[PDB]
Design a protein around this motif. Structure first.
Motif, PDB file in Angstrom:
ATOM      1  N   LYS A 169     -45.657  29.433 -18.534  1.00  0.00           N
ATOM      2  CA  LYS A 169     -45.480  29.854 -16.969  1.00  0.00           C
ATOM      3  C   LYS A 169     -44.387  31.296 -17.014  1.00  0.00           C
ATOM      4  O   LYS A 169     -43.453  31.170 -17.602  1.00  0.00           O
ATOM      5  N   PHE A 170     -44.711  32.150 -16.324  1.00  0.00           N
ATOM      6  CA  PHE A 170     -44.032  33.219 -16.207  1.00  0.00           C
ATOM      7  C   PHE A 170     -43.137  33.374 -14.586  1.00  0.00           C
ATOM      8  O   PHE A 170     -43.686  32.857 -13.487  1.00  0.00           O
ATOM      9  N   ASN A 171     -41.852  33.803 -14.707  1.00  0.00           N
ATOM     10  CA  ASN A 171     -41.179  33.953 -13.560  1.00  0.00           C
ATOM     11  C   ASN A 171     -40.844  32.602 -12.816  1.00  0.00           C
ATOM     12  O   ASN A 171     -41.231  32.793 -11.548  1.00  0.00           O
ATOM     13  N   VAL A 172     -40.340  31.746 -13.441  1.00  0.00           N
ATOM     14  CA  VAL A 172     -39.951  30.496 -12.507  1.00  0.00           C
ATOM     15  C   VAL A 172     -38.673  30.337 -11.922  1.00  0.00           C
ATOM     16  O   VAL A 172     -38.674  29.602 -10.862  1.00  0.00           O
ATOM     17  N   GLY A 173     -37.815  31.406 -12.330  1.00  0.00           N
ATOM     18  CA  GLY A 173     -36.478  31.151 -11.711  1.00  0.00           C
ATOM     19  C   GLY A 173     -35.378  30.689 -12.655  1.00  0.00           C
ATOM     20  O   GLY A 173     -35.516  29.344 -12.936  1.00  0.00           O
ATOM     21  N   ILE A 174     -34.233  31.219 -13.088  1.00  0.00           N
ATOM     22  CA  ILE A 174     -33.177  30.855 -13.850  1.00  0.00           C
ATOM     23  C   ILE A 174     -32.155  31.802 -13.381  1.00  0.00           C
ATOM     24  O   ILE A 174     -31.841  32.840 -13.653  1.00  0.00           O
ATOM     25  N   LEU A 175     -31.334  30.941 -12.282  1.00  0.00           N
ATOM     26  CA  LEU A 175     -29.994  31.456 -11.818  1.00  0.00           C
ATOM     27  C   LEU A 175     -29.325  32.039 -13.129  1.00  0.00           C
ATOM     28  O   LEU A 175     -29.137  31.584 -14.139  1.00  0.00           O
ATOM     29  N   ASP A 176     -28.880  33.403 -12.997  1.00  0.00           N
ATOM     30  CA  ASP A 176     -27.897  34.075 -14.110  1.00  0.00           C
ATOM     31  C   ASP A 176     -26.587  33.305 -14.495  1.00  0.00           C
ATOM     32  O   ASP A 176     -26.121  33.285 -15.763  1.00  0.00           O
ATOM     33  N   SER A 177     -26.113  32.585 -13.467  1.00  0.00           N
ATOM     34  CA  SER A 177     -24.881  31.683 -13.639  1.00  0.00           C
ATOM     35  C   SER A 177     -24.944  30.245 -14.372  1.00  0.00           C
ATOM     36  O   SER A 177     -24.302  29.952 -15.009  1.00  0.00           O
ATOM     37  N   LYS A 178     -26.458  29.681 -14.290  1.00  0.00           N
ATOM     38  CA  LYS A 178     -26.794  28.651 -14.653  1.00  0.00           C
ATOM     39  C   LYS A 178     -26.429  28.455 -16.269  1.00  0.00           C
ATOM     40  O   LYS A 178     -25.677  27.275 -16.470  1.00  0.00           O
ATOM     41  N   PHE A 179     -26.686  29.405 -17.028  1.00  0.00           N
ATOM     42  CA  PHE A 179     -26.277  29.223 -18.423  1.00  0.00           C
ATOM     43  C   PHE A 179     -25.415  30.048 -19.218  1.00  0.00           C
ATOM     44  O   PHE A 179     -25.317  30.986 -18.649  1.00  0.00           O
ATOM     45  N   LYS A 180     -24.858  29.596 -20.220  1.00  0.00           N
ATOM     46  CA  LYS A 180     -23.958  30.379 -21.032  1.00  0.00           C
ATOM     47  C   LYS A 180     -24.770  30.366 -22.492  1.00  0.00           C
ATOM     48  O   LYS A 180     -25.167  29.135 -23.013  1.00  0.00           O
ATOM     49  N   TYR A 181     -25.315  31.595 -23.041  1.00  0.00           N
ATOM     50  CA  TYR A 181     -26.136  31.669 -24.071  1.00  0.00           C
ATOM     51  C   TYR A 181     -25.389  31.971 -25.482  1.00  0.00           C
ATOM     52  O   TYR A 181     -26.266  31.623 -26.640  1.00  0.00           O
ATOM     53  N   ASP A 182     -24.162  32.139 -25.463  1.00  0.00           N
ATOM     54  CA  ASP A 182     -23.481  32.444 -26.939  1.00  0.00           C
ATOM     55  C   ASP A 182     -22.919  31.319 -27.146  1.00  0.00           C
ATOM     56  O   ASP A 182     -22.441  30.487 -26.406  1.00  0.00           O
ATOM     57  N   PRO A 183     -22.478  31.404 -28.615  1.00  0.00           N
ATOM     58  CA  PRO A 183     -21.508  30.192 -28.955  1.00  0.00           C
ATOM     59  C   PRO A 183     -20.376  29.782 -28.121  1.00  0.00           C
ATOM     60  O   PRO A 183     -19.703  31.013 -27.961  1.00  0.00           O
ATOM     61  N   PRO A 184     -19.964  28.738 -27.922  1.00  0.00           N
ATOM     62  CA  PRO A 184     -18.728  28.527 -27.060  1.00  0.00           C
ATOM     63  C   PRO A 184     -17.561  28.642 -28.536  1.00  0.00           C
ATOM     64  O   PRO A 184     -17.680  28.788 -29.492  1.00  0.00           O
ATOM     65  N   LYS A 185     -16.383  28.657 -27.628  1.00  0.00           N
ATOM     66  CA  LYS A 185     -15.187  29.106 -28.383  1.00  0.00           C
ATOM     67  C   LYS A 185     -15.123  27.802 -29.575  1.00  0.00           C
ATOM     68  O   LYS A 185     -14.712  28.187 -30.688  1.00  0.00           O
ATOM     69  N   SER A 186     -15.361  26.446 -29.028  1.00  0.00           N
ATOM     70  CA  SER A 186     -15.270  25.516 -30.122  1.00  0.00           C
ATOM     71  C   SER A 186     -16.138  25.425 -31.187  1.00  0.00           C
ATOM     72  O   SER A 186     -16.229  24.353 -31.855  1.00  0.00           O
ATOM     73  N   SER A 187     -17.382  26.010 -31.074  1.00  0.00           N
ATOM     74  CA  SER A 187     -18.620  26.073 -31.913  1.00  0.00           C
ATOM     75  C   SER A 187     -18.144  26.448 -33.198  1.00  0.00           C
ATOM     76  O   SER A 187     -16.909  27.040 -33.671  1.00  0.00           O
ATOM     77  N   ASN A 188     -19.075  25.894 -34.113  1.00  0.00           N
ATOM     78  CA  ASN A 188     -18.626  25.975 -35.597  1.00  0.00           C
ATOM     79  C   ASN A 188     -19.650  27.002 -36.486  1.00  0.00           C
ATOM     80  O   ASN A 188     -20.827  26.636 -36.193  1.00  0.00           O
ATOM     81  N   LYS A 189     -19.026  27.775 -37.020  1.00  0.00           N
ATOM     82  CA  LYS A 189     -20.068  29.078 -37.441  1.00  0.00           C
ATOM     83  C   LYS A 189     -20.536  28.405 -38.980  1.00  0.00           C
ATOM     84  O   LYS A 189     -19.756  27.844 -39.694  1.00  0.00           O
ATOM     85  N   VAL A 190     -22.084  28.436 -39.163  1.00  0.00           N
ATOM     86  CA  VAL A 190     -22.616  27.902 -40.455  1.00  0.00           C
ATOM     87  C   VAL A 190     -23.656  28.979 -40.721  1.00  0.00           C
ATOM     88  O   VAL A 190     -24.188  29.721 -39.893  1.00  0.00           O
ATOM     89  N   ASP A 191     -23.895  29.031 -42.126  1.00  0.00           N
ATOM     90  CA  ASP A 191     -24.571  30.516 -42.466  1.00  0.00           C
ATOM     91  C   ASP A 191     -25.934  30.271 -42.143  1.00  0.00           C
ATOM     92  O   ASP A 191     -26.448  31.238 -41.412  1.00  0.00           O
ATOM     93  N   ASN A 192     -26.711  29.713 -42.739  1.00  0.00           N
ATOM     94  CA  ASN A 192     -28.340  29.282 -42.363  1.00  0.00           C
ATOM     95  C   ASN A 192     -28.419  27.958 -42.405  1.00  0.00           C
ATOM     96  O   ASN A 192     -28.944  27.557 -43.572  1.00  0.00           O
ATOM     97  N   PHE A 193     -28.423  27.038 -41.358  1.00  0.00           N
ATOM     98  CA  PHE A 193     -28.573  25.713 -41.549  1.00  0.00           C
ATOM     99  C   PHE A 193     -29.801  25.209 -41.072  1.00  0.00           C
ATOM    100  O   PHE A 193     -30.371  24.059 -41.222  1.00  0.00           O
ATOM    101  N   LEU A 194     -30.575  26.075 -40.401  1.00  0.00           N
ATOM    102  CA  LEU A 194     -32.007  26.008 -39.971  1.00  0.00           C
ATOM    103  C   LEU A 194     -33.014  26.622 -40.773  1.00  0.00           C
ATOM    104  O   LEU A 194     -33.955  25.937 -40.924  1.00  0.00           O
ATOM    105  N   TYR A 195     -33.119  27.909 -41.444  1.00  0.00           N
ATOM    106  CA  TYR A 195     -34.093  28.323 -41.934  1.00  0.00           C
ATOM    107  C   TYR A 195     -34.281  28.189 -43.593  1.00  0.00           C
ATOM    108  O   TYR A 195     -35.084  28.101 -43.991  1.00  0.00           O
TER     109      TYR A 195
END
Ligand code: STE
Length: 195
Positions: A169-195
């Motif tokens: 579905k396209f253009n459902v609405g996502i307020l720009d403030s709702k979400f933070k998309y970058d890693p938080p300060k407390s996040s743990n960098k890991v090399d390639n744990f997914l691929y």
């Protein structure tokens, strides 16, 4: 009318330049497991996936992919596509990969070259733009430029990552403030744990 893969993808690219967001039911395979949930994509380059079968949350700002593990109280992030200049899926496909028809210009089955409803494009990495952790994608498009499946081939040679999108579905609405998309300060960098 004899449309080339490049011309077909120009139309896809232009379509997605004029869409604000996308919601989809998403199934994807990582580390030998099927994950199932809901994708919200804020164009051009941000997304969040909330999973159904567990409390993990995947977030991307177009550069990093962060996985929240709330049962542990922390998160882990890797590069979404190390080697890429980023800017979201369409920009990446349009600028770092050369596009061809996977099998033909004709409408085919998702799985075979038999007749079906999908146009399938192969994106092959331009290595003069740097190596990346994903060197090819095969993307199946339903008839209104809607993405049905993205198959990502890790350069490592590991299992392919198959991403199934349904209930798009396209253009459902996502307020720009709702979400933070970058890693938080407390996040743990890991090399390639997914691929
Ligand atoms: C529009 C659909 C994109 C959603 C893909 C998320 C699936 C989780 C596994 C990620 C592996 C594939 C990496 C694809 C890189 C895409 C680049 C971008 O969106 O900025």
């Amino acid at each position: 009318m004899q449309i080339s893969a490049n011309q077909y993808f120009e139309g896809i690219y232009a379509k997605y330049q004029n869409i604000e967001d996308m919601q989809a039911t998403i199934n994807f395979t990582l580390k030998g497991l099927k994950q199932t949930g809901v994708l919200l994509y804020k164009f051009p380059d941000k997304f969040i996936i909330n999973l159904d079968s567990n409390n993990q949350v995947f977030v991307s700002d177009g550069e990093f992919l962060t996985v929240y593990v709330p049962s542990l109280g922390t998160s882990f992030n890797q590069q979404l596509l190390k080697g890429s200049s980023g800017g979201g899926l369409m920009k990446v496909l349009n600028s770092e990969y050369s596009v061809s028809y996977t099998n033909s210009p004709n409408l085919e089955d998702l799985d075979s070259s038999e007749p079906g409803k999908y146009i399938k494009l192969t994106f092959s990495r331009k290595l003069y733009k740097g190596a990346a952790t994903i060197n090819s994608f095969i993307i199946a498009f339903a008839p209104d430029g809607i993405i049905r499946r993205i198959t990502a081939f890790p350069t490592s040679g590991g299992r392919e990552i198959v991403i199934d999108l349904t209930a798009v579905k396209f253009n459902v609405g996502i307020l720009d403030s709702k979400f933070k998309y970058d890693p938080p300060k407390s996040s743990n960098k890991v090399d390639n744990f997914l691929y």
